[PDB]
Amino acid sequence: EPPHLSFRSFVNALRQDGDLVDINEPVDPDLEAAAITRLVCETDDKAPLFNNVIGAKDGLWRILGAPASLRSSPKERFGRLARHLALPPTASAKDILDKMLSANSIPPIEPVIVPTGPVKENSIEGENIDLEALPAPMVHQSDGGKYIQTYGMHVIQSPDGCWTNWSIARAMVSGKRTLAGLVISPQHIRKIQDQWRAIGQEEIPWALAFGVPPTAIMASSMPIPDGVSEAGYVGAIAGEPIKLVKCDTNNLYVPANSEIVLEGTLSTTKMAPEGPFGEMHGYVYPGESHPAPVYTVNKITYRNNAILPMSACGRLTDETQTMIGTLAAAEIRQLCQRAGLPITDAFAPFVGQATWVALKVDTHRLRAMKTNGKAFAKRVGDVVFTQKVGYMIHRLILVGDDIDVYDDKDVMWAFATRCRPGTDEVFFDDVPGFWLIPYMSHGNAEAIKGGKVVSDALLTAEYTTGKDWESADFKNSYPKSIQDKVLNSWERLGFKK
Amino acid sequence: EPPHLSFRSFVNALRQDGDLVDINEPVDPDLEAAAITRLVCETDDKAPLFNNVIGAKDGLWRILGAPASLRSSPKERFGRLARHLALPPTASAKDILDKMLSANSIPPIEPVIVPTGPVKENSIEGENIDLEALPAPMVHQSDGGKYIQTYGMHVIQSPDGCWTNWSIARAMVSGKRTLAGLVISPQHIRKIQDQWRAIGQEEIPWALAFGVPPTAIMASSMPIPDGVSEAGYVGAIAGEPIKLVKCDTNNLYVPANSEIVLEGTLSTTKMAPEGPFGEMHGYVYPGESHPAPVYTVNKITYRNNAILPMSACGRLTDETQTMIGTLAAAEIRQLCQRAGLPITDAFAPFVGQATWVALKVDTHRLRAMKTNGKAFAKRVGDVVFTQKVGYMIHRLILVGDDIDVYDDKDVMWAFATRCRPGTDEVFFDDVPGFWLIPYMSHGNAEAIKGGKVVSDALLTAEYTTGKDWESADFKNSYPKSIQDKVLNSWERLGFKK
Ligand SMILES: Cc1cc2c3c(c1C)C(C)(C)C[C@@H](O)N3c1c(nc(O)[nH]c1=O)N2C[C@H](O)[C@H](O)[C@H](O)COP(=O)(O)O
């Protein structure tokens, strides 16, 4: 199976690319594996594959850190993400987001069923399960538990049987047979939990699959539409079906070549202390647990030489900024286009810590729409901040089509020089607000409401008569004849290539 | 004479550091010199010394571009600035600003008069002067003239004779014997021009000194207090007097080793078209000239082999971002300390395009005040935004003492995660606004008023009981024993140094 369709084939692709370190020395899953991974993420180094985790037994487990973090080569910065998606290692951020959006305009390719696969090579069942005896990592020193679940796919199906959702949500080991993890509004795992709650089900069939096909984990992190089963969307991205096998203990289906599958139930009735957890915004709050739903594990199936993927998330740059913000930005682009707004591109600048999205405006179309920044900024916020895809994003920055929204430097330049603070901003006090941001849950106003802004970083003339400045930069303040002279002289004179 | 007291010594210091290219090929002062310089600024390369400027005659002139721009090596990033100030090339931005602040708490070292110096080696006088025939650079293609003056020192004295101001303000060639340049409120050149106008003086004695002692050009860019002559401040920074020679044609004094001195008058009545100019925020507006005062030049004196310094300012990173906002931040820190606010440090983040200052708060002292961010942000703005030192700055960001204000990554992390948009901001509609910023002059509200904000990026508990989180980073989320095990294994396992 190709790398985008098999986690094991993806790991070997990173090895072939020289983007993987095989660590064969013993590494402790209590902090050491995550500390190595954290420093990889903070330095854009090669992904670490821990082949000798202390406490591993009977094939459970190796650990892959930083599975979708950045490479240090500028020309292949996004290559570990590209290897999730059948793209070359030189793919741009736009190429990745365009590929993830490509399935929203074409028929799903429905999964196919196989009778077995590598995920059935080994099993542990019932009273033989002891989750506290497995090498689940301690990911940050002040976490409230061992976060086994930082890069697996939760599988949960609606009561009518017709919608099966795939998504990432954190979970930690809470006991011999239990996890606790976030099941928050407005996420689909919570929407489906509440559908079951409403018909009186206490324990919902559930599976959690680790080391799924890489296209599948990318869709699991993307807010594709309500009621759309990720499996068919993934098939459409890949141009071929995902091969699924039925769980042994329930009627759910998991990718046949998953590394590790947990089969069990998600409760509607029981919660347990969950967290704290070093999170996507770069914070942990020591001692601060909150109740979250209980998952019960009834069977584990796994591949020979199974690998658990791990996101050691926190300060820049890890999967929470390369995937959560960016895939939300992709869906916000789509939503703005479907609302009729003249948006060509969107990205989640790394500087914004997954809380900002920059929206690139087709200014020719903007001028034809005969509006103004104050009206336009309010309309954009009303469109985006009242939808699920806008939930995690607190600042939208509108920029014209001379700004590369995929380049944080261009976004900051435009923000700092084109948006008059206050005057050119529309603030949103009444929309859902993302409590996990420290200025929300640990701030001065309601943790779950408001705290959002649309920043109009289009200059006034961009709405009316057009761009009337020239950038004071090498590209725009010198004619081509002068630029060519300089570029042809540069290295001969003694300047750096 | 050492590099901080002689521009010629400073040029040799840059050559010795491997931070200067001697360009001996012919370079056109019409755009080509500035295009080279611009590309050096955008890529942090070596300073260009143009030894063969097309049209140079009679020893006028060589050009040094990028005199205070950044070096590419992380360990010596500010080295070219440090060589202005007798600091090592490894000096931090904080070391530079602390050195510039060092003189407002020691007595001035008054200049000493010498009967002659290298600046008297050559002269051109009266009708022999033709400023249009000199190789003044065209710095950007859409500029309104040849900006001879981007990095020289204007010398002007008050009517009482007690205050001689040294400052940088742009000027372009306007005619055979004239320059036109910005003389704007609230700058000291304009305060002094207005003092002369009020007593009826038509032509004010003036000089412009190019290639001044590097300590002198740093103080020329710093907003030291009203009525304080830069010369004694400069002496205090340098630990000894600047040697000054009297002008031939007026009673002003210039540094004796200056490269080039123009002597003449600044008019209180005469105006000429001035600008546009590719400016510190990254913009030029083609065709947008505005009347500015006229300088008349009656004598030019200059060194053998004279060098004209040139700032090809615009997009990051050039002298307008290494010097203007940074030296303003230094003075804003001291203003806040005199006001009794608990500020320890200040810097102008590069991302803010010289419109942002981050203020570091002593959180122990803050907690003793028993205040809140909303009240505190208002007080800080009310102090800073009604003072000259705060004029060019539109956004102040308040951060706690776990944030390195000299590190744009830490400032952006704090701003994005600790300041709830709108809720945690105080907007200032009535204070003087810096019209040069595009969102002011070419924006939606008054060009000269408002558009300012103080952003409270302290979390709520920082005002009350203290910091209650831990960063989710390598430094703070893993014990020292684990960090050391990782750092000791890092290269042996196959990670990058
Ligand atoms: C890539 C990725 C995504 C997420 C998370 C992580 C990673 C690495 C953690 C490291 C585990 C941190 C955690 O906070 N986490 C997380 C989370 N969404 C939550 O509801 N809960 C979570 O705990 N998302 C985001 C969701 O995966 C997306 O919002 C997705 O769109 C949801 O799918 P759906 O509900 O739209 O189907």
Ligand SMILES: Cc1cc2c3c(c1C)C(C)(C)C[C@@H](O)N3c1c(nc(O)[nH]c1=O)N2C[C@H](O)[C@H](O)[C@H](O)COP(=O)(O)O
């Ligand atoms: C370092 C530097 C400083 C300045 C400028 C430049 C450089 C390189 C130009 C490239 C020429 C661009 C130009 O816009 N420019 C400039 C200017 N101030 C002005 O009133 N007018 C200007 O045209 N400053 C800033 C002033 O030098 C400082 O604000 C200083 O504090 C003033 O001295 P004072 O009035 O406080 O004595």
Ligand SMILES: [K+]
């Ligand atoms: K999903």
Ligand SMILES: [K+]
């Ligand atoms: K605007």
Ligand SMILES: [K+]
């Ligand atoms: K000055």
Ligand SMILES: [K+]
């Ligand atoms: K705050």
Ligand SMILES: [Mn+2]
């Ligand atoms: Mn979904």
Ligand SMILES: [Mn+2]
């Ligand atoms: Mn002054």
